Write a protein that binds this ligand. Structure first.
Ligand SMILES: CNS(=O)(=O)c1cnn(-c2ccccc2)c1C
Ligand SMILES: CNS(=O)(=O)c1cnn(-c2ccccc2)c1C
Lengths: 369, 369
C-alpha cells in the first residue's frame, strides 16, 4: 500500500522550487502516490513550469489574495485545504517556505492529524514583525512540522536552537538548484544568444529598490568601460525602463550593439541564458543561490550579502554600488581566465542538485517504506 | 492616557484562572483600562465566578463549541476575535493556556500587530497528538506571544530552550492560587459540610476514563478500609453517576453511612469544601497545584507524576493506583498528626497567591508605564 504524498503549490515562485521535488516523487511509483494541489492565484507561469516537468495537478483551489485581508485568506484557505485533505487522505503534506498558505496548509494537516514536511525550513530574522507576516508564518509552520528540509547548516542550526528534534532536521540543499537539470536544454535558442557569438556574455540584473538612481548610473558607466576594454564581451540587461531611465542608459552606453537592454525574461529563458553566461552581476538573493551551480561567477551589486556561505565558498564576491568597485572586480574576472575559472568551479554551498532526492529519502525512512 | 488591556475568558475553567488577574488590573485605574472579553458558550458558572470577583464583561462573543468542529471554532473564533480587537483597539491582549480560543485570539492579535501576554505558558509534552489539540495550541500561542507568564521554573525553562527572549519569560506562579483569597469564605454552607459535622473529611477526585477498571476498584477498596479503621472520617467522591459506578460502588463501598458519592461540585463549592478537607486523594493537576495553598495534604492517585516540584516541596506524595499504597499513605496521614501537619505547613511551589501582581508589574514595565 503506497505512501500518499501531497505537495502544495501555493505561489508562482514555488513552481520552480517544488516541481523538482514532485518529479523526484514521481520516480517512485511503486512506493509513492504523488498528489499535487495548486492553490496559487496566478497560473500562467506556474502552468508553464508544471508542464515542462510533466506534472498534472490533482486539485486546483482559487485562493484570492488580490486586495484580501489575512483573516479572509486564513479562513477560506483553511476550509479549502481541509476539504482537499479529507478527500485525498495524504499520509504527508509538503509545504514550502514562509507563506500564509504554507501556515494554513500545515494547520489543516494538523486538524486532520496528517504529518507535514516543511521544504525550505529554518530561515530566521528573530523579529516577529520583519518580515510581516513571513517570519511568524515560518515559526508557526515550524512548530507544526514533522520533518524540516533546511537548505543550509545555518537554517538547521536555527531550528536546533528552538529545541527541534535533530532527527527531524535534514540539510538538503535548495530544491531550486535541482530544477536546472530539467529547465536548461542544450538545444536552446534566444535572439539575445544569436547576436552573441563565441563572445563572452555578461548577464546583469538589478531590481532592488535601493539600486535606483546613482547605483544604476554607476553600473551603466562600469559596463561601458568593460565593453570598451574587452572587445569580445557582450552585456545583457533584462529590465523594463521608464523612458527617462532609457535615455540615461543610451547617453552612457551609446548604440554600438554589444550591450542589449531587453525585456525581463521568464524563469526558463533566464535559466538557459544564465547557463551560457561567462559572468553575472546581480542584486538578486536567488541568483546568488542558483547561478553558481551553472558554473557562472556571481558579482553582487551590494555592499553587504545575506548569502555569507556563497562568499566563504568563493561562488560570490561583493562588488558594491560604486562605479570603481564594479569596474574593478568585473574587469579582474574578464581579464584573468584563471580567476574566472576558479569561481566558475567553486562548489555551490546552497546545494548540489540532489535536495529533492534527500527529501524523498528522508520521507521514505520516516514512514518505514 | 491609559494602557488598554484586554483579558480573554474563553471557557468556564479559565474564569477562576483569569478573574484574579482582572481584579489586579482594576487596582490600577489611573494607568490601566481593563477590558474583559468573554467568548465561552456556557456562562452560568462563568457569570457566577465573575459576580463573586466583581467583574462585568465589556465584550461577549458566543463561540459555539458543543458538537462544533475544530475548523468551525477556528474560523468563527478568528473572525469574531479580529472584529472585537479592531473595535476596542487594545494595547495588549491577555490569553490563558492551551485552548483553541487562546491560539486564535493570539493569531487575531498578531494580524493586528497587538502584543500578546500568555498566562500559564511553557507546558510541554512534545507530543502533538497528546494532548490534541492542546499541546500544539500552546506551542502556536508560544511563537506569537510577547510576554510569557510561566507557573514554574520547569515551564520557563521549556521556553528558554525554544530560544524565546529570556527578558519576556517570567515565573509568576499559578493565578488559580490567587483566586482562593476571594473564593474561600470564612463561613460557608453546603450539604457535604452539614453531614460532615466535626468528622475529618477525605476528599477524593478521580477522572473516570483514566481510572476505569482496576484503579477505581482499588481506590474503593482502600477508602473502605480507611473508614473501617477511622470512626471519625467521611470520604466524599464527587462523580457523575452511571450504573457502572453504582454497581462498582455498592459492590465495594456498601451502605455504612460514611462514604458519599455526590454530583460534581462547581469550583466555588469545591474550593470551599477542599478548604475544610483533612486530606485529598486526587489525579487532578489543578488540585495538586491549588489544594496545598489551603493547607490540605494531597495524595496523588498515579504511579508517575509530571508535577515533581510538589513532591520535592512535600505538599504532594505519590500514592499510586494500587490499594495497599493508597491505604497505607492515607491511613498514615489520618493516624499521625505530625505527618499531617508537616505536609500541611509545606510551602506550595506552584505559587504564593501573588501571581497576578507579578503579571501586571511585568506588563507595566514592558510598556514603561
Ligand atoms: C525577471 N527579470 S530577470 O530576467 O532578470 C530574471 C528572471 N529570472 N530571474 C531569477 C532567476 C533565479 C532566481 C531569481 C531570479 C531573474 C533575476
Ligand atoms: C468535577 N469533579 S470535582 O467536583 O471533583 C472538581 C471540581 N473542581 N475540581 C477542580 C478544582 C481545582 C482544579 C481542578 C479541578 C474538581 C476535580
Amino acid at each position: 500500500e503506497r505512501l500518499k504524498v501531497m505537495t502544495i503549490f501555493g505561489t508562482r515562485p514555488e513552481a520552480i522550487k517544488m516541481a523538482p521535488l514532485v518529479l523526484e516523487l514521481q520516480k517512485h511509483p511503486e512506493k509513492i502516490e504523488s498528489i499535487v494541489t495548486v492553490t496559487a492565484q496566478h497560473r500562467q507561469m506556474l502552468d508553464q513550469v508544471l508542464s515542462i516537468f510533466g506534472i498534472t495537478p490533482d486539485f486546483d483551489l482559487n485562493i484570492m489574495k488580490d486586495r484580501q485581508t489575512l483573516i479572509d485568506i486564513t479562513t477560506r484557505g483553511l476550509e479549502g485545504l481541509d476539504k482537499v485533505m479529507k478527500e485525498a487522505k495524504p499520509d504527508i503534506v509538503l509545504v514550502h517556505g514562509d507563506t500564509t498558505t504554507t501556515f494554513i496548509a500545515s494547520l489543516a494537516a494538523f486538524y486532520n492529524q496528517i504529518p507535514v514536511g516543511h521544504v525550505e525550513a529554518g530561515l530566521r530574522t528573530w523579529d516577529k514583525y520583519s518580515p510581516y507576516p513571513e517570519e511568524m508564518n515560518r515559526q508557526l509552520t515550524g512548530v507544526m512540522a514533522d520533518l524540516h528540509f533546511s537548505p543550509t547548516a545555518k537554517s538547521a542550526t536555527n531550528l536546533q536552537k528552538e529545541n527541534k528534534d535533530e532527527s527531524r532536521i535534514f540539510i538538503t540543499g535548495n530544491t531550486a538548484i535541482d530544477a536546472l537539470k530539467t529547465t536548461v536544454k542544450e538545444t536552446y535558442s534566444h535572439p539575445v544568444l544569436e547576436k552573441l557569438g563565441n563572445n563572452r556574455l555578461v548577464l546583469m540584473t538589478a531590481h532592488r529598490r535601493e539600486n535606483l538612481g546613482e547605483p544604476m548610473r554607476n553600473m551603466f558607466r562600469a559596463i561601458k568601460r568593460l565593453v570598451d576594454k574587452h572587445e569580445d564581451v557582450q552585456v545583457v540587461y533584462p529590465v523594463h525602463m521608464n523612458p527617462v531611465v532609457r535615455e540615461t542608459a543610451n547617453d552612457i552606453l551609446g548604440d554600438y550593439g554589444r550591450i542589449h537592454l531587453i525585456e525581463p525574461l521568464d524563469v526558463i529563458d533566464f535559466h538557459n541564458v544564465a547557463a551560457r553566461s561567462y559572468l553575472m552581476l546581480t542584486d538578486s538573493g536567488g541568483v546568488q543561490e542558483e547561478a553558481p551551480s551553472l558554473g557562472v561567477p556571481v558579482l553582487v551589486l551590494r555592499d553587504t550579502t545575506e548569502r555569507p556561505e556563497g562568499i566563504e565558498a568563493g561562488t560570490l564576491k561583493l562588488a558594491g554600488t560604486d562605479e570603481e568597485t564594479i569596474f574593478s572586480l568585473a574587469d579582474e574576472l574578464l581579464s584573468d581566465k584563471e580567476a574566472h575559472d576558479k569561481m566558475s568551479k567553486a562548489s555551490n554551498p546552497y546545494g548540489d542538485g540532489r535536495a529533492s532526492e534527500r527529501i524523498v529519502e528522508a520521507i521514505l525512512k520516516h514512514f518505514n517504506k
